[PDB]
């Protein structure tokens, strides 16, 4: 359903496990953009690597506390993560996009309240992904996959997830 995780993937990665792909993408990002609409809140939070072309877009209803207690917290609803290369667009252009969208995860269903601060799952998922540690995102995807089918996991390949009705190949 709409409460079920849905994954898109370039056929480039059809034989990759989700864990292997996420670990390598977060290394590609390493240890332009912002919020749409912004300045500090948006339906998208997008970031470009300085280290490589790597870029992500977090989608949902996201909030950044800036200097307000609890400081430097990203909280709210995280519905989607899109991973790939080269951030484009912004508020002005009808939203952020990726020049090359490698993999996306939708219907994540994550919602972290401000009171949890940087302890929130949304904060940890997004901060990890851009600080060379996709472990938090992997844990949430693993749980969502097992909610559909317990023989699935982040160690499933993208084409195994397609065969299980979760994932969808896109052109390379």
C-alpha positions as a LaTeX table, in Angstrom:
\begin{tabular}{lrrr}
\hline
Residue & $x$ (\AA) & $y$ (\AA) & $z$ (\AA) \\
\hline
Unk1 & 0.00 & 0.00 & 0.00 \\
Unk2 & 0.97 & 3.71 & 0.44 \\
Unk3 & 2.28 & 2.68 & 3.94 \\
Unk4 & 4.60 & 0.14 & 2.14 \\
Unk5 & 8.16 & 1.24 & 1.30 \\
Unk6 & 8.72 & 1.68 & $-2.45$ \\
Unk7 & 12.18 & 1.72 & $-4.05$ \\
Unk8 & 13.41 & 2.90 & $-7.44$ \\
Unk9 & 16.80 & 1.94 & $-8.78$ \\
Unk10 & 18.94 & 2.39 & $-11.88$ \\
Unk11 & 19.52 & $-1.01$ & $-13.59$ \\
Unk12 & 23.24 & $-0.14$ & $-13.07$ \\
Unk13 & 22.66 & $-1.35$ & $-9.44$ \\
Unk14 & 20.16 & $-4.21$ & $-10.10$ \\
Unk15 & 22.61 & $-6.82$ & $-8.65$ \\
Unk16 & 23.62 & $-4.69$ & $-5.63$ \\
Unk17 & 22.33 & $-5.25$ & $-2.11$ \\
Unk18 & 20.69 & $-2.19$ & $-0.57$ \\
Unk19 & 23.30 & $-2.24$ & 2.24 \\
Unk20 & 26.23 & $-2.36$ & $-0.19$ \\
Unk21 & 24.77 & 0.42 & $-2.31$ \\
Unk22 & 24.05 & 2.69 & 0.69 \\
Unk23 & 27.46 & 2.10 & 2.31 \\
Unk24 & 29.23 & 2.91 & $-0.96$ \\
Unk25 & 27.05 & 5.95 & $-1.76$ \\
Unk26 & 27.68 & 7.42 & 1.74 \\
Unk27 & 31.45 & 6.89 & 1.10 \\
Unk28 & 31.05 & 8.56 & $-2.35$ \\
Unk29 & 29.36 & 11.55 & $-0.66$ \\
Unk30 & 32.23 & 11.40 & 1.91 \\
Unk31 & 32.63 & 12.54 & 5.59 \\
Unk32 & 24.24 & 24.53 & $-3.55$ \\
Unk33 & 21.12 & 23.04 & $-1.95$ \\
Unk34 & 19.13 & 23.87 & 1.15 \\
Unk35 & 15.45 & 23.78 & 1.96 \\
Unk36 & 12.54 & 24.13 & $-0.47$ \\
Unk37 & 10.83 & 26.52 & 0.21 \\
Unk38 & 13.29 & 27.42 & 3.00 \\
Unk39 & 14.93 & 29.21 & 4.52 \\
Unk40 & 15.01 & 26.64 & 7.39 \\
Unk41 & 11.95 & 24.46 & 6.66 \\
Unk42 & 10.78 & 22.65 & 3.58 \\
Unk43 & 9.18 & 19.75 & 1.79 \\
Unk44 & 12.72 & 19.08 & 0.54 \\
Unk45 & 16.17 & 19.33 & 2.11 \\
Unk46 & 18.84 & 18.83 & $-0.56$ \\
Unk47 & 22.62 & 18.69 & $-0.36$ \\
Unk48 & 25.50 & 18.46 & $-2.77$ \\
Unk49 & 28.84 & 16.87 & $-1.92$ \\
Unk50 & 31.89 & 19.16 & $-2.21$ \\
Unk51 & 33.99 & 15.92 & $-2.38$ \\
Unk52 & 32.21 & 14.43 & $-5.46$ \\
Unk53 & 29.08 & 14.86 & $-7.66$ \\
Unk54 & 27.13 & 12.91 & $-4.97$ \\
Unk55 & 23.87 & 14.59 & $-3.95$ \\
Unk56 & 20.76 & 13.63 & $-1.99$ \\
Unk57 & 17.21 & 14.99 & $-1.58$ \\
Unk58 & 15.27 & 14.32 & 1.61 \\
Unk59 & 11.51 & 14.77 & 1.09 \\
Unk60 & 8.71 & 15.22 & 3.62 \\
Unk61 & 7.99 & 18.07 & 6.03 \\
Unk62 & 11.36 & 18.99 & 7.48 \\
Unk63 & 12.46 & 21.61 & 9.97 \\
Unk64 & 15.90 & 22.86 & 11.05 \\
Unk65 & 16.17 & 24.50 & 14.47 \\
Unk66 & 19.35 & 26.54 & 13.66 \\
Unk67 & 20.37 & 28.14 & 17.02 \\
Unk68 & 16.96 & 27.52 & 18.72 \\
Unk69 & 16.85 & 24.85 & 21.48 \\
Unk70 & 17.45 & 22.05 & 20.68 \\
Unk71 & 20.09 & 23.61 & 18.42 \\
Unk72 & 21.10 & 22.21 & 15.04 \\
Unk73 & 18.30 & 19.61 & 14.92 \\
Unk74 & 16.68 & 18.37 & 11.70 \\
Unk75 & 13.22 & 17.11 & 12.64 \\
Unk76 & 9.75 & 16.51 & 11.22 \\
Unk77 & 8.51 & 14.02 & 8.65 \\
Unk78 & 10.88 & 12.14 & 6.35 \\
Unk79 & 8.95 & 10.36 & 3.60 \\
Unk80 & 11.66 & 9.92 & 0.96 \\
Unk81 & 15.39 & 9.87 & 0.23 \\
Unk82 & 16.65 & 10.19 & $-3.35$ \\
Unk83 & 20.36 & 9.48 & $-3.99$ \\
Unk84 & 22.43 & 10.25 & $-7.05$ \\
Unk85 & 24.58 & 12.85 & $-8.78$ \\
Unk86 & 24.49 & 16.62 & $-9.22$ \\
Unk87 & 21.82 & 18.64 & $-7.52$ \\
Unk88 & 19.68 & 20.86 & $-9.82$ \\
Unk89 & 16.71 & 23.24 & $-9.34$ \\
Unk90 & 15.44 & 24.65 & $-6.01$ \\
Unk91 & 12.33 & 26.60 & $-4.86$ \\
Unk92 & 12.50 & 28.80 & $-8.06$ \\
Unk93 & 12.56 & 25.75 & $-10.45$ \\
Unk94 & 9.54 & 23.82 & $-8.99$ \\
Unk95 & 11.80 & 21.97 & $-6.54$ \\
Unk96 & 15.20 & 20.29 & $-6.29$ \\
Unk97 & 16.05 & 17.38 & $-8.57$ \\
Unk98 & 19.07 & 15.20 & $-9.31$ \\
Unk99 & 20.76 & 15.27 & $-12.71$ \\
Unk100 & 21.16 & 11.45 & $-12.30$ \\
Unk101 & 18.80 & 9.83 & $-9.75$ \\
Unk102 & 20.55 & 6.46 & $-8.85$ \\
Unk103 & 18.19 & 5.08 & $-6.12$ \\
Unk104 & 15.19 & 6.41 & $-4.20$ \\
Unk105 & 13.28 & 5.18 & $-1.14$ \\
Unk106 & 9.67 & 6.36 & $-0.68$ \\
Unk107 & 7.00 & 5.89 & 2.01 \\
Unk108 & 9.63 & 5.82 & 4.77 \\
Unk109 & 6.98 & 6.96 & 7.30 \\
Unk110 & 9.53 & 8.57 & 9.64 \\
Unk111 & 8.38 & 11.35 & 11.97 \\
Unk112 & 10.60 & 12.77 & 14.71 \\
Unk113 & 9.41 & 15.41 & 17.17 \\
Unk114 & 11.50 & 18.48 & 17.99 \\
Unk115 & 11.81 & 17.40 & 21.67 \\
Unk116 & 14.15 & 14.49 & 20.74 \\
Unk117 & 16.70 & 16.95 & 19.34 \\
Unk118 & 19.63 & 15.34 & 17.54 \\
Unk119 & 18.53 & 11.98 & 19.10 \\
Unk120 & 15.58 & 11.92 & 16.62 \\
Unk121 & 15.55 & 9.17 & 13.98 \\
Unk122 & 15.07 & 11.73 & 11.16 \\
Unk123 & 18.13 & 13.69 & 12.32 \\
Unk124 & 20.27 & 10.56 & 12.65 \\
Unk125 & 19.17 & 9.12 & 9.29 \\
Unk126 & 19.95 & 12.27 & 7.31 \\
Unk127 & 23.04 & 13.31 & 9.28 \\
Unk128 & 24.48 & 9.81 & 8.90 \\
Unk129 & 23.87 & 9.60 & 5.16 \\
Unk130 & 25.83 & 12.89 & 4.61 \\
Unk131 & 28.60 & 12.06 & 7.25 \\
Unk132 & 29.77 & 8.69 & 5.79 \\
Unk133 & 27.52 & 6.42 & 7.95 \\
Unk134 & 24.30 & 5.12 & 6.25 \\
Unk135 & 23.72 & 2.75 & 9.25 \\
Unk136 & 20.67 & 4.67 & 10.60 \\
Unk137 & 18.97 & 4.77 & 7.18 \\
Unk138 & 19.82 & 1.07 & 6.63 \\
Unk139 & 18.17 & 0.14 & 9.95 \\
Unk140 & 14.94 & 1.94 & 9.04 \\
Unk141 & 14.82 & 0.45 & 5.53 \\
Unk142 & 15.52 & $-3.04$ & 6.96 \\
Unk143 & 12.50 & $-2.70$ & 9.29 \\
Unk144 & 10.22 & $-1.39$ & 6.49 \\
Unk145 & 11.24 & $-4.25$ & 4.17 \\
Unk146 & 10.56 & $-6.86$ & 6.88 \\
Unk147 & 7.10 & $-5.20$ & 7.48 \\
Unk148 & 6.26 & $-6.22$ & 3.86 \\
Unk149 & 7.99 & $-9.66$ & 3.87 \\
Unk150 & 10.37 & $-11.05$ & 6.60 \\
Unk151 & 12.52 & $-12.95$ & 4.04 \\
Unk152 & 13.53 & $-9.46$ & 2.80 \\
Unk153 & 16.29 & $-7.34$ & 4.32 \\
Unk154 & 18.79 & $-4.61$ & 3.39 \\
Unk155 & 20.94 & $-7.58$ & 2.23 \\
Unk156 & 18.38 & $-8.21$ & $-0.55$ \\
Unk157 & 19.45 & $-7.04$ & $-4.02$ \\
Unk158 & 17.42 & $-4.42$ & $-5.84$ \\
Unk159 & 16.26 & $-7.08$ & $-8.39$ \\
Unk160 & 15.25 & $-9.39$ & $-5.45$ \\
Unk161 & 13.20 & $-6.48$ & $-4.08$ \\
Unk162 & 11.64 & $-5.95$ & $-7.54$ \\
Unk163 & 10.70 & $-9.67$ & $-7.63$ \\
Unk164 & 9.09 & $-9.14$ & $-4.16$ \\
Unk165 & 7.03 & $-6.17$ & $-5.45$ \\
Unk166 & 8.87 & $-3.45$ & $-3.43$ \\
Unk167 & 11.33 & $-2.06$ & $-5.99$ \\
Unk168 & 11.23 & $-0.76$ & $-9.57$ \\
Unk169 & 14.10 & $-0.54$ & $-12.11$ \\
Unk170 & 14.72 & 2.76 & $-13.98$ \\
Unk171 & 16.94 & 3.26 & $-17.07$ \\
Unk172 & 20.78 & 3.54 & $-16.58$ \\
\hline
\end{tabular}
